[PDB]
């Protein structure tokens, strides 16, 4: 009953954390809101995503810095310090990914709901399995990669049946799936093909694209081109 009031407070605090750039706090507030059992609106969905994106983004960027040093610590001081600290950051990153994937499976991914809602969460599931795959090695790596692909593929199947080629959620899914192909699945030609097809099909409808999605879709289209240029340079 008063839950609705607490949920509103958690949402308000998530918006305050965002304005204060306190993304760890924001993510926890949104986690609490999700756990009130009510489905998220588009705005609340993006708050959840923004909060956890920033959390793992800092961890991923830190993990990449450390991995690079570790890979190059061979050529001054050496020692186990780099690996120990990298593993600490890696464990923290895995912990956040597990939390998001647990929320998706426990509260957010449903059979019902509009297509954009189901696509959004399955794409997010692909995304956080992809972050796990970025740091995974050996045994569980295959499983994690298969879990990312299955999530992205189900989202993709929905988006291509129920959404226009210029829809920002569909576009962002295709972008992330093409990154998955290139960076995770080591399928560079498949990544380039998906990015080009996604870009070309959206470009062919851009004349229609509603002004509400213009910027969002446009930005993703810009990113598809950036990756293509990065990937087709050779």
């Amino acid at each position: 009953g008063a839950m609705a009031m607490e949920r509103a407070s958690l949402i308000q605090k998530a918006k305050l954390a965002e304005q204060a750039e306190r993304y760890e706090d924001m993510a926890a507030f949104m986690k609490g809101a999700v756990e009130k059992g009510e489905e998220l609106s588009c705005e609340e969905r993006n708050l959840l995503s923004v909060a956890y994106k920033n959390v793992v983004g800092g961890q991923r960027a830190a993990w990449r810095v450390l991995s690079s040093i570790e890979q190059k610590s061979n050529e001054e001081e050496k020692g186990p310090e780099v690996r120990e600290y990298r593993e600490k950051v890696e464990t923290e990153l895995q912990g956040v990914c597990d939390t998001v994937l647990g929320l998706l499976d426990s509260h957010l991914i449903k059979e019902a709901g509009d297509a954009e809602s189901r696509v959004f969460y399955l794409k997010m599931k692909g995304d956080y399995y992809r972050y796990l795959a970025e740091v995974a090695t050996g045994d569980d790596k295959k499983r994690i990669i298969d879990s990312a692909r299955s999530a992205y593929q189900e989202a993709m199947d929905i988006s291509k049946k129920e959404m226009p080629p210029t829809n920002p959620i569909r576009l962002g899914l295709a972008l992330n799936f093409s990154v998955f192909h290139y960076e995770i699945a080591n399928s560079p030609e498949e990544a380039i093909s998906l990015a080009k097809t996604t870009f070309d099909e959206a470009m062919a409808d851009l004349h229609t694209l509603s002004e509400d999605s213009y910027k969002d879709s446009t930005l993703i289209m810009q990113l598809l081109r950036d990756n293509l240029t990065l990937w087709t340079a050779d």
Partner: peptide, 10 residues
């Protein structure tokens, strides 16, 4: 390759 760009917030 440098980190590819992925979907942004919103």
């Amino acid at each position: 390759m440098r980190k590819a760009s992925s979907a942004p917030a919103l």
